[PDB]
Design a protein around this ligand. Structure first.
Ligand SMILES: NC(=O)c1ccnc(Cl)c1
Lengths: 300, 304
């Protein structure tokens, strides 16, 4: 096979990772300009995390409660504020390694890279998608609280995700860099589970388009389906329903390969109902759903 | 537990990004690795496309002078003040030492071992991925256009061990290359002649490490109460295109065996049953496939 999944080069983000400590709790912060971003639940004690009043707890902590280390260099916290579920610590020194960046919010199914960190130090990087149930697959060994997800576009880092918690089912959940959660999760110690997950249909179709571009063509068939008829079948197999927007996002690949979206949908439908019958697609016996249509455009 | 839902990660690529440069000889452009005052790149940068069928590298190199080589780091042009060939790697001495040179080593890896590749085009890092040296000495790389000179590496305590440089794509879609001393992995040559990679095989010792990691995390559905001899395991495994296991591999898995109380040959018998029965819509550590690109070294560290 060819097509390998890649993460973005992580150097621009490595330069921003610092260590934030409040009391006993230590986690990762993102240091951009003269502000350090981290999950607000760093300020919690064991008594506090069962039902905390964060903004009340925040305003009554002194800046000296917060211990920020960039390597072996101490950043002095000169202010602090809360924005939804992210804590913003103002420090007296701007990060000279600050890249060109933006805070963006992504949609379930969209991909990004995560720079897994521990105690402010980068441990590894991996490529992932926002699952339809708003979780990210990854273990306790795939980064701890405050690790961030990002895309890179030209020289500009788009931060889209910050890790807040690892759920017991081998996934993690978090917010955008403005503190808004992805999914119906809350940042307190308390019984939470992710909803049943589904396959990102638009990404599977993107991946089948990539297979055609690579000359893997055995699954193409002469049939077309209606968007509804496909959805009736897809939903039975826990595939996400395909929307007209998804169809539109796939437009370029259809013109680029000659395979209309509802043509490829008849291929995928037959794959779901009859399996691959011992065959592979791009060398895999499994359908891939963490490549977006844009990922295909870029790599292919 | 700890590894539930584990994802393979590449090493953070920043230390290597600071070393990537663009090397151009005549009409050919590819990536070089700039460490101290030396840029390393594939020697086939000095070939025209005619030359690539039967290049005489000694004859082509003797005809080059330092000013034939254009080395660019961003918008800065580095001056080449020397050039020499070491096996299939060209070494360009430049008049500037790279201020971003990390602590580094050159090391040769064996098949089954893993590393990260920073895929670059025209000196610019494009993406990073984690992989293993396949048993047939190839790596399964990106879509790839002109990523020659992209390097593979490990990082240990901020020291970058460089182990791979990309030289060619084989007709099979996979990629072949050298260590940083210019010696190829496998029976390949930097030549556009008919070359074919051998049949690839699953890295059995890595799969066994993965199964041991699953057990350490309480994922036990695939265990059986059988054991096997080493030779009975290899007769079965080869017939699924799994690498034969050696006593060395058995010793390596020793710490995982002691941590779980499952003898290696007991786990070999479980793997034998997995091959017999398949994983059809079942998962181990949250993955629907048997992972063979995570090594015992990594498992033992991450599951102390
Ligand atoms: N003899 C065996 O234990 C065996 C292993 C794998 N597959 C089959 Cl069918 C049989």
């Amino acid at each position: 096979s060819g097509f390998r999944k890649m993460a973005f080069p992580s150097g621009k983000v490595e330069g921003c990772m610092v260590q934030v400590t409040c009391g006993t709790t230590t986690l990762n912060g993102l240091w951009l300009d003269d502000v350090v971003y981290c999950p607000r639940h760093v300020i919690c004690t064991s008594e506090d995390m069962l039902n905390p009043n964060y903004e009340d707890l925040l305003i009554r902590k002194s800046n000296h409660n917060f211990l920020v280390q960039a390597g072996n260099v101490q950043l002095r916290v000169i202010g602090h504020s809360m924005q939804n579920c992210v804590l913003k610590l103002k420090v007296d020194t701007a990060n000279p390694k600050t890249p060109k960046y933006k805070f963006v919010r992504i949609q379930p199914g969209q991909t990004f890279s995560v720079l897994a960190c521990y105690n402010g130090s980068p441990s590894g990087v991996y490529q992932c998608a926002m699952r339809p149930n708003f979780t990210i697959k990854g273990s306790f060994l795939n980064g701890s609280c405050g690790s961030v997800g990002f895309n890179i576009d030209y020289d500009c880092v788009s931060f889209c995700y910050m890790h807040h918690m690892e759920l017991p089912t081998g996934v993690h959940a978090g917010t955008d860099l403005e503190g808004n959660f992805y999914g119906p999760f809350v940042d307190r110690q308390t019984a939470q589970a992710a909803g049943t997950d589904t396959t990102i249909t638009v990404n599977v179709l993107a991946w089948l388009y990539a297979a055609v571009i690579n000359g893997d063509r055995w699954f193409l068939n002469r049939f077309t389906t209606t968007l509804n008829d496909f959805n009736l079948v897809a939903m039975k197999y826990n595939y996400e329903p395909l929307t007209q927007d998804h169809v539109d996002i796939l437009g370029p690949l259809s013109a680029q390969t000659g395979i209309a979206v509802l043509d490829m949908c008849a291929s995928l439908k037959e794959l779901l109902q009859n399996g691959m019958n011992g065959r592979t697609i791009l060398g895999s016996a499994l359908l891939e759903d963490e490549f977006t249509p844009f990922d295909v455009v870029r790599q292919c």
